[PDB]
Design a protein around this ligand. Structure first.
Ligand SMILES: [Mg+2]
Ligand SMILES: [Mg+2]
Ligand SMILES: [Mg+2]
Ligand SMILES: [Mg+2]
Ligand SMILES: [Mg+2]
Ligand SMILES: [Mg+2]
Ligand SMILES: [Mg+2]
Ligand SMILES: [Mg+2]
Ligand SMILES: [Mg+2]
Ligand SMILES: [Mg+2]
Ligand SMILES: [Mg+2]
Ligand SMILES: [Mg+2]
Ligand SMILES: [Mg+2]
Ligand SMILES: [Mg+2]
Ligand SMILES: [Mg+2]
Ligand SMILES: [Mg+2]
Ligand SMILES: [Mg+2]
Ligand SMILES: [Mg+2]
Ligand SMILES: [Mg+2]
Ligand SMILES: [Mg+2]
Ligand SMILES: [Mg+2]
Ligand SMILES: [Mg+2]
Ligand SMILES: [Mg+2]
Ligand SMILES: [Mg+2]
Ligand SMILES: [Mg+2]
Ligand SMILES: [Mg+2]
Ligand SMILES: [Mg+2]
Ligand SMILES: [Mg+2]
Ligand SMILES: [Mg+2]
Ligand SMILES: [Mg+2]
Ligand SMILES: [Mg+2]
Ligand SMILES: [Mg+2]
Ligand SMILES: [Mg+2]
Ligand SMILES: [Mg+2]
Ligand SMILES: [Mg+2]
Ligand SMILES: [Zn+2]
Lengths: 304, 50, 71, 177
RNA sequence: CACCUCGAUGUCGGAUCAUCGCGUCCUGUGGCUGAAGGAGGUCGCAAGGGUUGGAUUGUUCGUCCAUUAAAGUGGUACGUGAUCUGAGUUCAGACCGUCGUGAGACAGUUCGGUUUCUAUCUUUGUCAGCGAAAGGCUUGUUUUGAAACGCCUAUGCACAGUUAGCCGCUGGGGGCGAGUACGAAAGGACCAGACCCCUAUAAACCUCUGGUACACUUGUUGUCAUUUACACGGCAUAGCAAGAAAGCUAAGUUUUAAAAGGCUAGAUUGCCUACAUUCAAUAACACCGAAUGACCCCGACUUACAAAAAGUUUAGGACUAAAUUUAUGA
RNA sequence: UAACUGUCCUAAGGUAGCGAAAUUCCUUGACUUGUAAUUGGCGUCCUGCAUGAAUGGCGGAACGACUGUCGGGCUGUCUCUAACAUGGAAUCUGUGAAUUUGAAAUCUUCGUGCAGAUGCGAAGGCGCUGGCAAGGGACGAAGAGACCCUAUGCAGCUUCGCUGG
RNA sequence: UACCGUACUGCAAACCGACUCAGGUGGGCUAGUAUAUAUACUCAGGCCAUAGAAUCAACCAUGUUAAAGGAACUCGGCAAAAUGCACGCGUGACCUCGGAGGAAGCGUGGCUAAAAAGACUCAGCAAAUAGCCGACAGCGACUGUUUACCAAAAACACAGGAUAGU
RNA sequence: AGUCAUAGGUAGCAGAACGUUCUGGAACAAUUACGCUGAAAACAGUAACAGAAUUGAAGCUGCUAACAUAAGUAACACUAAAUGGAUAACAUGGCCGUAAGCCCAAGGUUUUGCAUAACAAACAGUGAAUACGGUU
RNA sequence: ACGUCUAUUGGACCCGAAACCGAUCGAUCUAGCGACGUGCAGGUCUGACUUUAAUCAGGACCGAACCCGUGUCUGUUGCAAGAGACUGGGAU
């Protein structure tokens, strides 16, 4: 799936001396890369973009609010999400944070990709992604991005890859109506119907809806609420559905759809949840459950 | 109704129609036999044997 | 639902690409009897191998057991 | 069209379900009469699952188990073998009474072929592993099995010495009534 | 008119699915208003997406039932039979009426009356294969210009422009604003700016509610087997009937702002101990999985506070090794 | 309205009993019912384009794989489709056709043109080749006769067409 | 007490259809539950050879089930669904007095009881077989016949009647 | 042998030639041909002069034969159901059972039996003796 | 006279009809007739005869064997140059 790449004529007629000296004096005169960011808590600039998260769908459950209404709650789990790489405006063309999640053994990963983690000094992640971030949002390599990055009542934009269903016809892929079951219709109860329009168009359109293998598609659900965050167990409880099956990782970000630059007064820590007293925290061991926050909302039964 | 099976075999009817004696019974049947002889057919009638 | 012209030798060869078989990159060879098969399959005398001399299995000692033969 | 492989369930084997259960009953009866049978991979995997179910039912040794096996297992010469030789042979084995070895393809239809046989018998093709593995009381596993509620589960003879002091008694025979 | 096809080529309908124009019915809007804001008449811009019911006619014509913000008009061989119908326009049977001496004619009414085709390549949807390299290192080094080592990039792989191209593209109604500015007065708004409800469309999901569930559980009829007409087994649509869990699904549940969102190619940057076999013949389970320092699969045991998908376990398969464990606290 | 009288060519101007009917142009015939809404039926009425005792007029029991309409029950026909079962289809192995075919290495739009272009002109696009699907185009394929016209054309039939024993 | 037939096949891979063709092909014999040669299972007997192997495509064919509705679909309830059985009650108009008519509509059914009765099941015509019903018209009195290969009808015939000839 | 003039063509008309088979002139290939070119074309490279023609073919939905394409595509779905290392004798399971069982007729006319490949059709097989059917 | 080109009569440059006139063969398909023989499970209703009783009638009714092909669907170089499934009509 690539064009024929390069004719690559080698002979430069001896102008190669000028280009080699120009390249040597171009790399050596480029600026030194900026220092390690070393982030502590920072101010909330209104036009500043935060990082995202790689969370794992764990299924759906039932909860009732204090007002007494059932809410469909999916539960996501943050699998040791850390910052693996970094891109910034001086050395790269853009300013981004590269995130990693999960874990894989050394024998289970390709040697070209394992070398990247061994150079970075981070464990071998199973998924690597990146998010565009502002200049003041560059968090250093090795920093965890857990459930505490998000707050209860926040609206997020979850991105997921849909369940695979295989090849289906236009009845359930495009939702087309077919022909009647019993009025003389011959062998065409699930036919797509007319596809072109005769000699004057003379062809089928480039965007025609025809049967195909739907499934595994990157669909984003926009502006979904966060109902509960368990910081100790890395659990976030979104309300509503998340695309994808259970066990597949999904992407999260602050909802840019609801963006007045105020972030709707959500209590978002800007660089990440910079943890104070990181000591006195147990490793995977005999730990217990912790406390969580939740939004309330007003008048779900204001009248009948 | 499927066609194609007009030939219903019967030895009595075959010998009684196209046999030697009905050919010899009438004059024009005898000239039928005579031109079968003039053509040179190895089988003169449907019921000839030896 | 019907070809309008006759297919050329070049176009026929291009269309017949799905019909060709891929070569296998591994084979399990018995050093004695020279038999050839996959690494996940038995190809000794119990399976089809008229050339088997039993040297394919190099050790099989199991004398002791005790049970009730139902007769 | 219902999903059987990919959603753990029984194979369809190109047959209606009543034909499918009857064919599996015939094959499990044949598997215990001659202890190694050869068939296609799909029947071989289905036979392995069915053999585990039937062998455990014979291992129960109860009257209801005999009644259920009487319909499941056809021969009756081999209903005795399942309840006596097979039950005593695998009395302490936690499943996995059968192994599968692939044997290539068959001539009539190029279908993959597997050898399916009972393990732990004279005439098997790989040495079995012991069903139990007596624990060292001076190792980590034994202490984990003391702090947590696990039994000893040691290898045992058919009649251990814990019944010897009952059976030795001449006043516990009842004369045979 | 008869220029094109009689080596015969679907129109005079709707069923599904479309694309485009604006001479705009609505939604978004500006001017003139005989302009009380309402409610109207024009006129100017704007084609994003919306235009529903069915009762009657073979009718694309038309009403009139009553709902909406509205129930748009056209190019589409008055779009669309190698997707569907043949209800009407081409016959063959018959009757009634008209004309005819009669064979017969009727674009007068009726009843009945064969819709063939396995996709070559042009499009289109989707899923895949092929598109090799090592170049010189005068090797930075070594003697016994060949051997690997060190370099620039070359492929591969990963993240992939404040980076190309392309697709989708953001629907409304009623309240609250307001018993209101207005207005003798009845009569009631522009602003949608935001909140509450609904309804579409689009994208998902199975948490709820249901449907289905054919090796699940219960009850039962006939009959064949049954040295017990105890239990169990076969067949009768799974024999029948009832109730089920996973999975799928909608009638269910969420989300649908300026730009959001997706698809394909990709300057760069980074990395490289990468010949690609097995775990089931349709991996779609599984590459964001495993192959013995392995719970990947399968089996076994337990769970009614899972009417069953989790937990333990290396029993079996993904073979494999020894001089401190046939081996992970899997 | 024309019942009785007045007229003209004329075999004679159609009775009790029929009629927008198998057959009535106006047509959605005014009239009642039928439905919320009826041009297709039912029962009246009259204005019979182009009805009517041997082309038999007037209705009836029973009968009809005949035709047009109304109620009850019933249900996926439908609102609006979903799951499952069996057998094809899709994968592999074995056997193994035909329709079609000037040669092809066959892009899009606009224009031109035997007047609807893959092949011409202008501009643009396109790594290459397939599997599985959908059928808008190739005026797809299948019949040198669907319909109209013509022939020193045939054939059969009809008659107060012509000629014949 | 001679002559001819005597193999094999004969609802079929051996006959008639170009075929190992889903078509057409005459007569006879037969066991039980049981009762009819129908229906479900089975006896004697026969068969499971003429493509096989797994699997979750879409789609097609044939079916099962489906919440709330129910002809709203459609030229037209076309196609499906529904009634479908033996013992009792009952039972319209119209009519050629025969019929309509099984009108319509409602009870009673398996199993145990040498027996006045009962058990429990959601379900007792328990599985398979065995009419949808009523009303208004049109046409043809009726049963029949008709275009083998798109029309089974109001077309043809029919008993009867009239006329003409002999 | 140097100058001038002419040379687009359908229907049509006129002129010059090439090639195929056979014959006459006594016999022009017994022992082959093969320097790979020549010519304006038809063509030539095994005479020439005359003559006799079933004398020249991409072109008639022509006829015959062979070979492709579609394409290793469609098809190998009416049914009872198969399993065990075999279209198994044995075992297990299933299907018909007013037939898918048995006995005949019409019709067919040897399609009927024998070998764990094989050298086997070349070999076998139809018996009227119960008052069997026919012939009368 | 020979040679060439036209013209007339011939099939007369070649191939192609629908046709017309005679006299062969075909009722083994199908239509009618004729002779001989055979078949119509199970029930239901009505009328008649005889009854100590093993009889007849109805172009009667429901329904197998058998005959036919109404509607729908499948199939359309099909299983079949007219078939299959389910509904159907007749069945003294
Ligand atoms: Mg059809
Ligand atoms: Mg028939
Ligand atoms: Mg013939
Ligand atoms: Mg299927
Ligand atoms: Mg069954
Ligand atoms: Mg669930
Ligand atoms: Mg279950
Ligand atoms: Mg049985
Ligand atoms: Mg599905
Ligand atoms: Mg193991
Ligand atoms: Mg299948
Ligand atoms: Mg054009
Ligand atoms: Mg493609
Ligand atoms: Mg294709
Ligand atoms: Mg003329
Ligand atoms: Mg038959
Ligand atoms: Mg045939
Ligand atoms: Mg046959
Ligand atoms: Mg049976
Ligand atoms: Mg078979
Ligand atoms: Mg219901
Ligand atoms: Mg019943
Ligand atoms: Mg009758
Ligand atoms: Mg009749
Ligand atoms: Mg010239
Ligand atoms: Mg000139
Ligand atoms: Mg000579
Ligand atoms: Mg010639
Ligand atoms: Mg193949
Ligand atoms: Mg066998
Ligand atoms: Mg015979
Ligand atoms: Mg002359
Ligand atoms: Mg004759
Ligand atoms: Mg019948
Ligand atoms: Mg009937
Ligand atoms: Zn070997």
């Amino acid at each position: 799936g690539y064009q024929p790449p390069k004719p690559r004529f080698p002979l430069p007629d001896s102008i190669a001396s000028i280009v080699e000296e120009k390249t040597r004096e171009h790399r050596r005169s480029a600026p030194a890369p900026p220092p390690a960011p070393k982030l502590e808590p920072r101010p909330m600039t209104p036009t500043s973009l935060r990082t995202g998260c790689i969370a794992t769908k764990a299924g759906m459950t039932q909860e009732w609010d204090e007002h007494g209404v059932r809410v469909p709650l999916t539960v996501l789990w943050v699998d040791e999400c850390q910052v693996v790489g970094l891109k910034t405006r001086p050395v790269h063309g853009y300013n981004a944070l590269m995130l990693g999640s999960g874990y894989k053994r050394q024998k289970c990963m390709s040697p070209s990709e394992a070398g990247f983690f061994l150079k970075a000094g981070v464990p071998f992640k199973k998924l690597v992604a990146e998010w565009q971030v502002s200049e003041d949002a560059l968090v250093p390599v090795g920093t965890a991005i857990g459930a505490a990055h998000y707050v209860a009542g926040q609206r997020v934009d979850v991105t997921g890859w849909t369940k695979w269903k295989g090849f289906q016809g236009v009845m359930r892929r495009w939702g087309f109506k077919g022909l009647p079951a019993s009025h003389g219709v011959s062998l065409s109860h699930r036919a797509p119907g007319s596809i072109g329009n005769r000699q004057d168009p003379g062809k089928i359109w480039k965007g025609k809806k025809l049967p195909g293998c739907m499934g595994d598609e990157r669909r984003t659900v926009h502006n979904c609420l966060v109902y509960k965050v368990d910081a100790a167990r890395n659990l976030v409880y979104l309300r509503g559905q998340v695309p994808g099956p259970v066990g597949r990782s999904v992407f999260l970000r602050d909802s840019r759809l609801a963006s007045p630059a105020l972030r709707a007064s959500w209590g978002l820590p800007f660089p990440t949840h910079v943890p104070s007293a990181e000591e006195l925290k147990a490793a995977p061991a005999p730990g217990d459950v912790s406390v969580v926050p939740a939004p309330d909302g007003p008048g779900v039964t204001a009248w009948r | 109704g499927n066609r194609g099976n007009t030939y219903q075999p019967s030895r009595r009817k075959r010998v009684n129609r196209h046999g030697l004696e009905k050919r010899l019974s009438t004059p024009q049947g005898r000239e039928v036999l005579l031109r079968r002889l003039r053509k040179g057919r190895w089988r003169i009638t449907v019921d000839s044997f030896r | 639902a019907t070809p309008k012209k006759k297919l050329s030798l070049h176009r026929r060869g291009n269309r017949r690409v799905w019909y060709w078989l891929k070569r296998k990159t591994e084979v399990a060879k018995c050093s004695y009897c020279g038999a050839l098969s996959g690494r996940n399959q038995m190809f000794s005398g119990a399976a089809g191998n008229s050339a088997c001399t039993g040297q394919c299995v190099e050790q099989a000692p199991t004398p002791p057991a005790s049970s009730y033969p139902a007769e | 069209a219902r999903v059987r492989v990919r959603l753990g369930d029984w194979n369809r084997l190109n047959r209606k379900w009543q034909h499918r259960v009857s064919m599996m009953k015939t094959m499990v009866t044949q598997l215990l009469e001659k202890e190694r049978i050869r068939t296609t991979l799909a029947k071989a995997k289905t036979l392995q699952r069915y053999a585990d179910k039937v062998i455990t039912l014979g291992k129960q040794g109860t009257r209801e188990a005999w009644s259920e096996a009487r319909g499941i297992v056809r021969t009756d010469r081999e209903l005795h073998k399942l309840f006596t030789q097979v039950a005593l042979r695998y009395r302490e084995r936690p499943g996995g009474f059968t192994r599968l070895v692939r044997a290539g393809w068959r001539e009539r239809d190029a279908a993959p072929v597997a050898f399916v046989e009972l393990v732990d018998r004279p005439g098997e093709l790989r040495p079995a592993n012991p069903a139990l593995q007596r624990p060292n009381p001076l190792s980590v596993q034994a202490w984990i099995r003391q702090q947590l509620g696990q039994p000893a589960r040691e290898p045992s003879p058919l009649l251990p010495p814990s019944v010897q002091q009952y059976l030795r008694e001449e006043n516990r025979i009842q004369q045979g009534r």
